[PDB]
Design an enzyme around this catalytic site. Structure first.
Site, PDB file in Angstrom:
ATOM      1  N   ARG A 177       0.862  -1.177   0.000  1.00  0.00           N
ATOM      2  CA  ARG A 177       0.000   0.000   0.000  1.00  0.00           C
ATOM      3  C   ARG A 177       0.910   1.242   0.000  1.00  0.00           C
ATOM      4  O   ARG A 177       0.911   2.014   0.967  1.00  0.00           O
ATOM      5  CB  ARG A 177      -0.936   0.028   1.226  1.00  0.00           C
ATOM      6  N   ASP A 242       2.459  -8.014   7.276  1.00  0.00           N
ATOM      7  CA  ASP A 242       1.361  -7.365   6.558  1.00  0.00           C
ATOM      8  C   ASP A 242       0.236  -8.247   6.048  1.00  0.00           C
ATOM      9  O   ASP A 242      -0.398  -7.914   5.029  1.00  0.00           O
ATOM     10  CB  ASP A 242       1.893  -6.456   5.418  1.00  0.00           C
ATOM     11  N   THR A 243      -0.045  -9.342   6.751  1.00  0.00           N
ATOM     12  CA  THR A 243      -1.153 -10.207   6.331  1.00  0.00           C
ATOM     13  C   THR A 243      -2.175 -10.340   7.444  1.00  0.00           C
ATOM     14  O   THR A 243      -3.184  -9.618   7.447  1.00  0.00           O
ATOM     15  CB  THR A 243      -0.633 -11.594   5.854  1.00  0.00           C
ATOM     16  N   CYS A 348      -0.640 -20.500   0.057  1.00  0.00           N
ATOM     17  CA  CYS A 348       0.040 -19.947   1.222  1.00  0.00           C
ATOM     18  C   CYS A 348       0.667 -20.982   2.159  1.00  0.00           C
ATOM     19  O   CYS A 348      -0.001 -21.918   2.609  1.00  0.00           O
ATOM     20  CB  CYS A 348      -0.955 -19.093   2.007  1.00  0.00           C
ATOM     21  N   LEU A 349       1.955 -20.807   2.449  1.00  0.00           N
ATOM     22  CA  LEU A 349       2.645 -21.655   3.420  1.00  0.00           C
ATOM     23  C   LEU A 349       2.448 -21.191   4.855  1.00  0.00           C
ATOM     24  O   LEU A 349       2.679 -21.961   5.796  1.00  0.00           O
ATOM     25  CB  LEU A 349       4.142 -21.710   3.082  1.00  0.00           C
ATOM     26  N   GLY A 350       2.063 -19.925   5.016  1.00  0.00           N
ATOM     27  CA  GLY A 350       1.874 -19.343   6.348  1.00  0.00           C
ATOM     28  C   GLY A 350       0.464 -19.559   6.889  1.00  0.00           C
ATOM     29  O   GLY A 350       0.163 -19.111   8.008  1.00  0.00           O
TER      30      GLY A 350
HETATM   31  C1  HEM Z   1      -4.364 -13.901   6.618  1.00  0.00           C
HETATM   32  C2  HEM Z   1      -3.064 -14.168   6.404  1.00  0.00           C
HETATM   33  C3  HEM Z   1      -2.455 -14.509   5.027  1.00  0.00           C
HETATM   34  C4  HEM Z   1      -3.008 -14.491   3.792  1.00  0.00           C
HETATM   35  C5  HEM Z   1      -4.439 -14.061   3.398  1.00  0.00           C
HETATM   36  C6  HEM Z   1      -2.001 -14.926   2.838  1.00  0.00           C
HETATM   37  C7  HEM Z   1      -2.172 -15.036   1.480  1.00  0.00           C
HETATM   38  C8  HEM Z   1      -1.267 -15.612   0.599  1.00  0.00           C
HETATM   39  C9  HEM Z   1      -1.457 -15.765  -0.848  1.00  0.00           C
HETATM   40  C10 HEM Z   1      -2.709 -15.283  -1.610  1.00  0.00           C
HETATM   41  C11 HEM Z   1      -0.368 -16.363  -1.366  1.00  0.00           C
HETATM   42  C12 HEM Z   1      -0.137 -16.763  -2.846  1.00  0.00           C
HETATM   43  C13 HEM Z   1       0.392 -15.569  -3.645  1.00  0.00           C
HETATM   44  C14 HEM Z   1       0.506 -15.866  -5.135  1.00  0.00           C
HETATM   45  O1  HEM Z   1      -0.134 -16.817  -5.631  1.00  0.00           O
HETATM   46  O2  HEM Z   1       1.257 -15.135  -5.838  1.00  0.00           O
HETATM   47  C15 HEM Z   1       0.545 -16.628  -0.253  1.00  0.00           C
HETATM   48  C16 HEM Z   1       1.790 -17.241  -0.355  1.00  0.00           C
HETATM   49  C17 HEM Z   1       2.693 -17.361   0.647  1.00  0.00           C
HETATM   50  N1  HEM Z   1       2.541 -16.947   1.971  1.00  0.00           N
HETATM   51 FE1  HEM Z   1       0.770 -16.282   2.800  1.00  0.00          FE
HETATM   52  N2  HEM Z   1      -0.840 -15.217   3.529  1.00  0.00           N
HETATM   53  C18 HEM Z   1      -1.087 -14.985   4.879  1.00  0.00           C
HETATM   54  C19 HEM Z   1      -0.191 -15.178   5.916  1.00  0.00           C
HETATM   55  C20 HEM Z   1       1.115 -15.587   5.771  1.00  0.00           C
HETATM   56  C21 HEM Z   1       2.097 -15.621   6.832  1.00  0.00           C
HETATM   57  C22 HEM Z   1       1.799 -15.233   8.295  1.00  0.00           C
HETATM   58  C23 HEM Z   1       3.253 -16.101   6.316  1.00  0.00           C
HETATM   59  C24 HEM Z   1       4.609 -16.325   7.008  1.00  0.00           C
HETATM   60  C25 HEM Z   1       5.035 -15.613   8.048  1.00  0.00           C
HETATM   61  C26 HEM Z   1       3.027 -16.365   4.906  1.00  0.00           C
HETATM   62  C27 HEM Z   1       3.929 -16.895   4.026  1.00  0.00           C
HETATM   63  C28 HEM Z   1       3.689 -17.199   2.713  1.00  0.00           C
HETATM   64  C29 HEM Z   1       4.658 -17.810   1.843  1.00  0.00           C
HETATM   65  C30 HEM Z   1       6.084 -18.256   2.187  1.00  0.00           C
HETATM   66  C31 HEM Z   1       4.014 -17.924   0.498  1.00  0.00           C
HETATM   67  C32 HEM Z   1       4.698 -18.455  -0.765  1.00  0.00           C
HETATM   68  C33 HEM Z   1       4.169 -19.762  -1.322  1.00  0.00           C
HETATM   69  C34 HEM Z   1       4.793 -19.945  -2.687  1.00  0.00           C
HETATM   70  O3  HEM Z   1       5.047 -18.940  -3.409  1.00  0.00           O
HETATM   71  O4  HEM Z   1       5.028 -21.136  -3.059  1.00  0.00           O
HETATM   72  N3  HEM Z   1       1.716 -16.033   4.597  1.00  0.00           N
HETATM   73  N4  HEM Z   1      -0.025 -16.142   0.918  1.00  0.00           N
HETATM   74  C1  LIG Z   2       0.566 -11.826  -1.915  1.00  0.00           C
HETATM   75  C2  LIG Z   2       1.085 -12.072  -0.496  1.00  0.00           C
HETATM   76  C3  LIG Z   2      -0.011 -11.926   0.559  1.00  0.00           C
HETATM   77  C4  LIG Z   2       1.771 -13.433  -0.444  1.00  0.00           C
HETATM   78  C5  LIG Z   2       2.425 -13.454   0.940  1.00  0.00           C
HETATM   79  C6  LIG Z   2       2.820 -11.982   1.166  1.00  0.00           C
HETATM   80  C7  LIG Z   2       2.324 -11.272  -0.108  1.00  0.00           C
HETATM   81  C8  LIG Z   2       2.209  -9.757   0.000  1.00  0.00           C
HETATM   82  C9  LIG Z   2       3.256 -11.788  -1.164  1.00  0.00           C
HETATM   83  O1  LIG Z   2       4.310 -11.057  -1.719  1.00  0.00           O
HETATM   84  C10 LIG Z   2       2.895 -13.218  -1.469  1.00  0.00           C
END
Ligand code: HEM
Ligand SMILES: CC1(C)[C@@H]2CC[C@@]1(C)C(=O)C2
Ligand SMILES: [K+]
Length: 405
Positions: A177, A242-243, A348-350
């Site tokens: 943002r 930021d999620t 998402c891995l998180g």
């Molecule tokens: C409400 C919380 C969250 C939401 C809605 C969210 C959403 C997402 C989404 C939509 C993607 C896929 C992005 C794409 O397809 O380009 C993603 C990927 C990922 N997220 Fe989350 N995220 C959240 C929390 C977190 C947290 C807390 C972590 C780690 C501290 C995390 C780590 C990751 C990682 C490592 C990926 C990469 C997976 C890959 O590219 O193979 N996320 N997330």
């Molecule tokens: C799109 C996302 C929510 C996902 C995890 C953090 C984020 C901002 C990314 O760059 C991948």
């Protein structure tokens, strides 16, 4: 403001939606995006905003495009183009096959095994923060809980000092943002400037923190490079800072405005996990996308190599074609369809960490502060971008109606 219309794009598909400042923002950010799902709007539109790009407006298309990495590449996954081009995080800037080997390493630091025994510390911090607010009868929820709870958990996991939060949070927010003071590339480089020395320190002297684990990791049996480690740690910081931080505020704003839903979870606490999922659908918040790898006809529309397509994770679950009465929150909804955590190979891995943080928050907040409301005369303002959020959330309550555990 509006980019010139490319020669291959017909006028009848033009809908000038601005993902960083949508016109209907005052209604709520999900509501503002849902204008793209009014009956007169096509499944796939072109906006001239933010450099010009496609938007898939319906869950069917969003899902299809996320599955088809051969046509829709993650190499340039953000709007505007300058941001998507500069974006080089791992694994998110990679397509299969190369992407996949990096997921296992990222799982070692944020996956279920790590959640399961961060468990106690997550619980402890939620309870302590909420108990400290409880007797005050008010808080600024974004600053007082939504930020410190997930961010302090992440900084603990990553072995980073809490006094670094204001700087890192500012930088992360410029990627999702932007306030206009930094380009994506500048914010990214500043994050890398922070990380590079720490990564080398922890390759020289490994700890047990997430940065040490990534930096000393193997990827399909060969050593990770310093560069690759940096590109993975950048992503971990954005996910940590930021999620969940934004999602908690959408959820708590909803609970403040809906006493019936609060009472449901107080009376039937076993419903909290289902409530979490339904809130993840209703207050979905991410909008990333892909770049066309070739000319491609998709749902009767001619897309050209190099075109960007926004594929809003937010929109799938709000689509009435996926969920009836989609703006209604129903904790008993039988099939909660959404792509809040993404779709396809980049799921998402998180998400396990996120769900734990959400579920702990709902349980521990409602245990202590069952009755609360939006502050008198406050109008809650949302903000839109790659990840959407809540600008401020002033809450009030009568301390006599609360419970110290
Ligand atoms: C409400 C919380 C969250 C939401 C809605 C969210 C959403 C997402 C989404 C939509 C993607 C896929 C992005 C794409 O397809 O380009 C993603 C990927 C990922 N997220 Fe989350 N995220 C959240 C929390 C977190 C947290 C807390 C972590 C780690 C501290 C995390 C780590 C990751 C990682 C490592 C990926 C990469 C997976 C890959 O590219 O193979 N996320 N997330
Ligand atoms: C799109 C996302 C929510 C996902 C995890 C953090 C984020 C901002 C990314 O760059 C991948
Ligand atoms: K890129």
């Amino acid at each position: 403001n509006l980019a010139p219309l490319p020669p291959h794009v017909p006028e009848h598909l033009v809908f000038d939606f601005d993902m960083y400042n949508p016109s209907n923002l005052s209604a709520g950010v999900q509501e503002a995006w849902a204008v793209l799902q009014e009956s007169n709007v096509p499944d796939l539109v072109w906006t001239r905003c933010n450099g010009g790009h496609w938007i898939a407006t319906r869950g069917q298309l969003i899902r299809e495009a996320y599955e088809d990495y051969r046509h829709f590449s993650s190499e340039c996954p953000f709007i505007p183009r300058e941001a998507g081009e500069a974006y080089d995080f791992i694994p998110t800037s990679m397509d299969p096959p190369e992407q996949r080997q990096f997921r296992a390493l990222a799982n070692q630091v944020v996956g279920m095994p790590v959640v399961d025994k961060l468990e106690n510390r997550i619980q402890e911090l939620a309870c302590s923060l909420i108990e400290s607010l409880r007797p005050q009868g008010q808080c600024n929820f974004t600053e007082d809980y939504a930020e410190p709870f997930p961010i302090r958990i992440f900084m603990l996991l990553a072995g980073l000092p809490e006094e670094d939060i204001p700087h890192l949070k500012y930088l992360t927010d410029q990627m999702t943002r932007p306030d206009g003071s930094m380009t994506f590339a500048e914010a990214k480089e500043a994050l890398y400037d922070y990380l590079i020395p720490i990564i080398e320190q922890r390759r020289q002297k490994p700890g047990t923190d997430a940065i040490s684990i990534v930096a000393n990791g193997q990827v399909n049996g060969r050593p990770i490079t310093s560069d690759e480690a940096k590109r993975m740690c950048g992503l971990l910081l954005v996910g940590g800072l930021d999620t969940v931080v934004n999602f908690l505020s959408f959820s708590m704003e909803f609970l403040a405005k809906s006493p019936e839903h609060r009472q449901e979870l107080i009376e039937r606490p076993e419903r909290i996990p289902a409530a979490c999922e339904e809130l993840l659908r209703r207050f979905s918040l991410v909008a990333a996308g892909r770049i066309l790898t070739s000319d491609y006809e998709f749902h009767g529309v001619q897309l050209k190599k190099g075109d960007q397509i926004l594929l809003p994770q937010m929109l799938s679950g709000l689509d009435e074609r996926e969920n009836a009465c989609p703006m209604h929150v129903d904790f008993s909804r039988q099939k909660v369809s959404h792509t809040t955590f993404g779709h396809g190979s980049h799921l998402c891995l998180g998400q396990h960490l996120a769900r734990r943080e959400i579920i702990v928050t709902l349980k521990e907040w409602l245990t202590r502060i069952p009755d609360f409301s939006i502050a008198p005369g406050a109008q809650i303002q949302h903000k839109s971008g790659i990840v959407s959020g809540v600008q401020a959330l002033p809450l009030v309550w009568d301390p006599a109606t609360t419970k110290a555990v």
